Design a protein around this ligand. Structure first.
Ligand SMILES: Cc1cc2nc3c(=O)[nH]c(=O)nc-3n(C[C@H](O)[C@@H](O)[C@H](O)COP(=O)(O)OP(=O)(O)OC[C@H]3O[C@@H](n4cnc5c(N)ncnc54)[C@H](O)[C@@H]3O)c2cc1C
Ligand SMILES: Cc1cc2nc3c(=O)[nH]c(=O)nc-3n(C[C@H](O)[C@@H](O)[C@H](O)COP(=O)(O)OP(=O)(O)OC[C@H]3O[C@@H](n4cnc5c(N)ncnc54)[C@H](O)[C@@H]3O)c2cc1C
Lengths: 563, 563, 75, 85
């Protein structure tokens, strides 16, 4: 068996990788040890970066059809039990109106809830239709790199046969116990994240719409067990920190707080997680992404979203090198750009955990309270005294602080800042962040930042600056007085053998600055240009259309391509 | 004929007064010169203050059913003609996500579009059903006050008869040429409004969904004539600054910019206003409100809304005096609180006109271009030069500044600050506005400010702080540690024979601070108290439930009622 | 007082007559003993003949906005 | 369902397709809790194939049946694997 890219693993990072590569004309073979896409829901929060990617490759409308929209995710309830009495709520997943504006302004896309259980088969299937070969019941056993490619050994769990595959590159998308990362020799850091901690999950069915429809939320946390919506509002799953038989049904009833709504206990799983990140993600011809280089807690739902973005960063790069349009040094930028994201999210997901204890300290409970102790803490909370008033305020302070892992981390989600050989510096210094860079997105058009979203119009219809770009190619954005970029881009494109579309945004053009929001956001004059990588990151910025400005485009694209 | 209050005029201010008064048990007689409620739509923008009043008296849902919602109002298009090319757009009626968040945060209610044509009969209907006597085709001729009441005269346009109608008070709600204001001898000021030119209005029917559906807007301005939606998207009105035959069908056809869609010309009207405000609105037993004391331009849609709020200030006050619960000096607060609003809106509505000239100047167009002159303006606008870039930016700067009269004036709408004998000062100084007080609402719970909106929950259901108050009665708001307010309020209540309802917001109460937003907004400790007048304004604020804090309750109510 | 048609009563039959007549250019005077339109709901079912009339005189859409639709009435 | 010269041309007429006539619609609604919809095979297929795999079926693409031979106890089929050859 022969291919250009062997993709070990078929979860979000592997599947996304295969879809993008097939969309780019690259032969790849994607494998999976197991029989079918992930049985469990296993993560549900889709952020905007991920929706942007689905948009670009035309799966957003489809993703939105299966997903629970934003309006359903906001009411995060802290209570004794579902049918008991609330301690309070916080506005999760950017449901506060100010948080909602900041969200809507950053992207044409929105938070939704789509269990991995559905996301996975949707992308795997698109990989197969776009051109990727997909082979389940097939296990990677190891490989051996040489100068020209790699030769991997596979074990076929249907035929029992064992065969080899010859490929030019391997992507290790094989998860939290990546054998591809082991054999590649990737160093890991940060093993220090508490004692190794695991949770248990109990799926179950039950019509709890009568306790949920009037306070629509993605989660209900009981003082700690999480009650999590799979489908509103009849498919569910209990989660909590860590064998169990059908007694699991007593737990559930207790979490629901009533035993009066018929329940149906489904599969019971555990999940372990050894929090670490890979310090480097690349070794020779091997590239790892996903859980294979960042392993962490679920706080914030950064896992699947960062994984998918890992693949979006890499695919167009493999394609340009495989086609000979780019020197293989272009692949160096994968580690330069994505490994800082990897450490960032492990540390972030872990730091969010320490926002919970203070909730208990506010209730003057201990790390673990009894049933009597819990009912005393509720009584103390309803005290009509100044000491009680101070406690209600202390509880509210603590609760509010947990928002960082429950939709408050907009900055974490969006504020990528790349520095590498695939981003051509413009000479400006790093302007930094005016507000907290974890809580708040700051749009930037400095090279290394994601292209900012604003609305233009095409045929008097709204269209995002993002929808002008992507499509697996470079796009250069300018305005009417920057007409010269059209020709300068043609010359670079012809010499370098690379597609780069130019868009001249302005009155009378194909794309119109209808609200003037592009002039407001671009940070440069009308004749300036922004060059956008296939992955939506700005790689070059000129402040005008002068000679030196124009002449630099060639140098920039040459430098990005390693040529 | 005898009655407590004679209401001259049955537009928004009169109809509202009648409804509120009849709701409070007060006998009133409302009259109108004409056959019907106003034939023209006239005035369409319903701001949040007005929707809050409708909510309080229970007409909001019905208002919403007839009203075009907010999301249909946002696209304000500046162009040559409807089917021509746009110069650009501004986000009107707070459609920009950030404006929208500020909007949603300020009230439980929202902008809608509801022409006067539908609003009047709705309210006049409710007035009549709540208890008001309503009599049209009846004209106020004059009146004579004396120490115990007034004895005005009426001309009955059906029977031809002429009769007298004694009453304790007269409300002059009779419009821009109020004969009641003349007779009462109210001084006016600020006549200088630029030559007092009228506008012309052409109704017409035409299906313009294909030019509108994709950029849903409340109005489309052509370079200047306003094409304004009455019903989306088939009923319209054409408007511009100032006889006309059914030639008006030609004008429209060029304003539509295409004589292809069938047009059916309706009625043609002229409006010519004189800009002024009454320096005082009260004289003996005569109280004026609406156009009768504030007459200005349409910029901002402040007329109908301020008019209705005038009526909301006054009714509960008349009712208390008529019932003997309040001294007649309570009525002095009407002038003190509403007259500053009256000058504020005439001046504001006028100041907005001056935001349009700059649009032409950016275009380099004289106060009145020709066809060929305009055509050249659009050519100069697509000029690919550095100077053409400077011109596009100049046009955008000028357009953006027109928002102040097209939704941007949130602060103007909501930042009422009352100083009068009906607001009991709490000893704190005025905190002022951190942001521009015309553009931005700043919530405050200092006496003199409208009660801030926040979401509480009742039965785990969202309910506004506002929905706890109103209903033509004083409400006192506190928390669990302010338990003592309940008792003080009862004592005060018996003493003065005045109903005040107490709400102790907190865990396990009727109303719950479920998001903690009340603790955040109140500006005082949990055991503090806010006293809210029937019209939603705060009149007293205690910072806690200490002895002196509680003792002051009686003093405040006794001072608000003039007793 | 003079008029072409004197309409005694302003409930559905009188109000409708007045609207139709005024639509046809006919001078009419409609009177009512009481203060208001009827306080009680009284009568709620609007059959198709009536909606057709509202449609003809252009009040159907407004009728539909205030009305509970058919699919709420079945059980 | 429109019969015409071209989409933007002039209709010859329409017919009420897929039981859209109200009498046809009642007969339809009375026969089943379910309704006609339009779902291209392009989407139907991956939705069911994926559910087969999750429910317990082994699914193997790029694999071709070449023939078989039945006997008394079962059948033995020969497959050609288009990935491994
Ligand atoms: C039980 C469980 C519960 C989770 N719950 C949450 C949650 O609540 N919230 C949240 O944010 N995240 C959660 N996650 C994490 C999550 O699903 C991801 O971070 C994401 O799936 C990782 O993407 P991958 O595509 O990087 O990972 P994976 O989805 O694990 O992909 C690895 C793939 O490679 C395959 N594979 C592995 N080894 C081999 C091999 N040797 N040969 C061939 N194929 C191989 C695997 O079968 C799989 O197909 C959960 C994970 C698990 C396992
Ligand atoms: C043609 C026209 C177009 C307008 N367009 C706009 C617009 O586009 N935007 C905007 O913001 N505002 C507009 N307005 C202004 C507007 O209608 C509001 O300011 C508001 O209606 C005024 O409320 P009132 O209730 O205070 O005034 P009115 O609506 O005029 O109510 C006055 C009432 O008193 C009656 N009356 C007067 N004199 C006597 C008398 N001697 N005896 C008995 N009854 C009497 C009148 O018939 C009427 O019933 C327009 C006004 C007109 C006339």
């Amino acid at each position: 068996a022969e291919t250009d890219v062997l993709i070990v693993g078929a979860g979000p990072a592997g599947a996304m990788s295969a879809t993008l590569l097939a969309s780019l004309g690259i032969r790849s073979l994607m494998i999976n040890r197991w029989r079918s896409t992930s049985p469990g829901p296993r993560s549900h929060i889709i952020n905007q970066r991920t929706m942007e990617i689905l948009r670009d490759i035309g799966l957003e409308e489809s993703a939105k059809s299966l997903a629970v929209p934003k309006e359903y995710m906001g009411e995060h309830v802290y209570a004794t039990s579902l049918a008991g009495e609330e301690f309070g709520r916080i506005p999760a997943w950017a449901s506060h109106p100010q948080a909602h504006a900041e969200h809507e302004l950053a992207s044409p896309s929105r938070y939704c809830d789509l269990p991995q259980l559905y996301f996975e088969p949707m992308v795997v299937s698109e990989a197969a239709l776009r051109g990727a070969d997909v082979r389940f019941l097939t296990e990677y056993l190891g490989h051996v790199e040489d100068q020209d490619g790699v030769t991997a050994r596979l074990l076929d769990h249907v035929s029992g046969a064992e065969y080899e595959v010859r490929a030019k590159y391997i992507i290790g998308a094989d998860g939290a116990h990546s054998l591809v990362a082991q054999n590649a020799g990737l160093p890991f850091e940060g093993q220090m994240g508490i004692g190794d901690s695991g949770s248990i999950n109990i799926e179950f069915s039950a019509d709890l719409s009568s306790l949920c429809e009037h306070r629509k939320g993605d989660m209900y946390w009981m003082f700690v067990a999480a009650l999590q919506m799979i489908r509103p509002w009849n498919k569910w799953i209990c989660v909590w920190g860590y064998i169990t038989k059908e007694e699991a049904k007593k737990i559930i009833h207790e979490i629901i707080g009533t035993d009066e709504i018929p329940v149906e206990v489904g599969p019971i799983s555990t999940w372990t997680i050894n929090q670490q990140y890979a310090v480097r993600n690349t070794s020779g011809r091997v590239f790892c992404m996903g859980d294979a280089v960042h392993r962490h807690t679920p706080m914030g739902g950064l896992g699947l979203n960062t994984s998918v973005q890992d693949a979006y960063n890499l695919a167009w790069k493999l394609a340009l090198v495989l086609k000979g349009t780019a020197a293989p040094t272009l692949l160096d930028s994968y580690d330069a750009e994505r490994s800082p994201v990897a450490k960032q999210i492990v540390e972030r997901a872990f730091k969010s955990l320490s926002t919970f204890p203070p909730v208990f300290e506010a209730l003057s409970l201990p790390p673990a309270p009894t049933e009597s102790e819990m009912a005393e803490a509720l009584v103390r909370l309803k005290d009509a005294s100044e000491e009680g008033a101070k406690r209600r305020a202390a509880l509210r302070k603590a609760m509010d602080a947990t928002i960082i892992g429950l939709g408050g981390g907009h900055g974490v989600e969006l504020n990528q800042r790349y520095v590498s050989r695939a981003v051509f510096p413009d000479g400006t210094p790093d302007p930094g962040f005016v507000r907290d860079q974890e809580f708040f997105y700051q749009a930037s058009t400095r090279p290394g930042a994601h292209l900012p979203h604003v609305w233009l119009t095409e045929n008097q219809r709204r269209i995002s600056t993002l929808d002008l770009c992507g499509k697996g190619r470079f796009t250069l954005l300018t305005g009417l007085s920057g007409a010269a970029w059209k020709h300068e881009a043609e010359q670079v494109s012809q010499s370098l053998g690379i597609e780069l579309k130019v868009c001249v945004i302005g009155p009378g053009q194909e794309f119109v600055d209808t609200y003037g929001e592009y002039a407001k956001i671009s940070e440069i004059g009308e004749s300036g240009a922004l060059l956008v990588r296939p992955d939506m990151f700005i790689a070059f910025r000129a402040k005008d259309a002068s000679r030196e400005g124009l002449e630099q485009l060639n140098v920039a694209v040459k430098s990005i391509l390693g040529r």
